[PDB]
Amino acid sequence: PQVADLKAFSKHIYNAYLKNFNMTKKKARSILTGKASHTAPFVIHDIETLWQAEKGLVWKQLVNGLPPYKEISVHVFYRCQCTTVETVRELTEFAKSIPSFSSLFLNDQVTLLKYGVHEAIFAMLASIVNKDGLLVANGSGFVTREFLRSLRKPFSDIIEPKFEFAVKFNALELDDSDLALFIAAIILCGDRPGLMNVPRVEAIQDTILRALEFHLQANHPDAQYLFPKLLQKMADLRQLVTEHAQMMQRIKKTETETSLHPLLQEIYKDM
Ligand SMILES: COc1cccc(-c2ccc(C(=O)N(Cc3ccccc3OCCCCCC(=O)O)C3CC3)cc2)c1
Ligand SMILES: CCCCCCCO[C@@H]1O[C@H](CO)[C@@H](O)[C@H](O)[C@H]1O
Ligand SMILES: CCCCCCCO[C@@H]1O[C@H](CO)[C@@H](O)[C@H](O)[C@H]1O
Numbered sequence: 001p002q003v004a005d006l007k008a009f010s011k012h013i014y015n016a017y018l019k020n021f022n023m024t025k026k027k028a029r030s031i032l033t034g035k036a037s038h039t040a041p042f043v044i045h046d047i048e049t050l051w052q053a054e055k056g057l058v059w060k061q062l063v064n065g066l067p068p069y070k071e072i073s074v075h076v077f078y079r080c081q082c083t084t085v086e087t088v089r090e091l092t093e094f095a096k097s098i099p100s101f102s103s104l105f106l107n108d109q110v111t112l113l114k115y116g117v118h119e120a121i122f123a124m125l126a127s128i129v130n131k132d133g134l135l136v137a138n139g140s141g142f143v144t145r146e147f148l149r150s151l152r153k154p155f156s157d158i159i160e161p162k163f164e165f166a167v168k169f170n171a172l173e174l175d176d177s178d179l180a181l182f183i184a185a186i187i188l189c190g191d192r193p194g195l196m197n198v199p200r201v202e203a204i205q206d207t208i209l210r211a212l213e214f215h216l217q218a219n220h221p222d223a224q225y226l227f228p229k230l231l232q233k234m235a236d237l238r239q240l241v242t243e244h245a246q247m248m249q250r251i252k253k254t255e256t257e258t259s260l261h262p263l264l265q266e267i268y269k270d271m
């Protein structure tokens with residue numbers, strides 16, 4: 001009985017995912033591997049190719065809309081911020097497309113997004129990453145990991161840990177239908193500080209995890225220990241976000257000319 005009900009539940013979460021996210025892992029891997037396309041991403045690996053990309057690639061966020069130019073490393077940070085905020089927007093609409101999330105009081109919705117979106121962002125980020133770099137500008141660009149390493153501290157340091165996480169996460173070979181459930185479980189988390197209706201959120205979280213376990217039995221029948229591996233990745237994401245927030249505090253303290261987006265300020269306020 002419940003195996004069948006949870007299958008339906010999972011399909012509605014997958015549909016929420018397909019409706020709301022700009023890029024799927026399926027599309028991202030087809031770009032990263034070269035698989036079937038008349039166009040290849042422009043590679044950004046140094047200052048000259050960065051300038052050419054700002055001149056010539058199509059950006060969701062127009063360069064003139066970014067804060068005033070300071071230097072190369074900050075400019076990259078500002079592009080990172082733009083994408084982070086765009087993904088918060090997508091995660092919010094994904095969450096709101098899940099009925100049991102929308103049925104929560106709005107203040108609990110905000111609490112879940114506040115403490116869950118970065119975890120979800122760093123999980124979804126793996127979809128566009130390989131060991132050598134990541135996709136940018138809706139897949140029309142590829143920024144090398146080596147170039148990102150060459151940025152000055154603190155900006156290079158806040159980037160590299162996410163690659164380290166992503167390469168290990170991608171070795172589990174999740175597809176979009178697995179990720180939709182994984183991300184929903186990250187957002188619908190009963191552990192978040194200040195939740196008003198903890199039992200309700202705990203119950204939803206449990207349903208999603210049961211759906212995930214069963215989804216993996218069907219979709220990855222040969223993969224041993226995959227469900228417990230993913231619970232551990234959820235734990236790992238919490239630690240990755242703690243470190244990230246600590247690094248952001250140092251950027252706020254020491255990089256005083258760097259602007260932080262007001263929405264992210266609200267997210268870090270009580271972290
Ligand atoms: C010319 O254009 C470019 C040049 C060079 C790099 C880029 C670029 C590179 C990476 C992204 C990106 O997709 N992201 C950012 C990202 C990716 C990996 C590691 C870290 C990281 O952000 C850390 C800072 C986050 C601050 C916000 C905060 O939380 O307060 C995804 C997370 C969203 C977009 C754009 C564009
Ligand atoms: C203000 C300092 C920080 C500026 C750098 C980040 C700007 O990002 C963009 O800002 C818009 C304003 O909300 C969002 O709507 C977009 O989704 C987001 O991509
Ligand atoms: C359902 C609409 C009416 C909601 C009214 C309740 C608002 O509560 C506020 O929720 C915020 C998180 O969302 C917390 O950060 C605040 O501390 C808390 O005061």
Ligand SMILES: CCCCCCCO[C@@H]1O[C@H](CO)[C@@H](O)[C@H](O)[C@H]1O
Nearest residue numbers: 088092110113114263266267269270
């Ligand atoms: C778009 C969803 C992303 C959530 C954005 C981050 C939430 O910020 C919080 O908003 C609450 C008001 O609602 C305040 O009470 C809190 O002090 C503040 O930390």
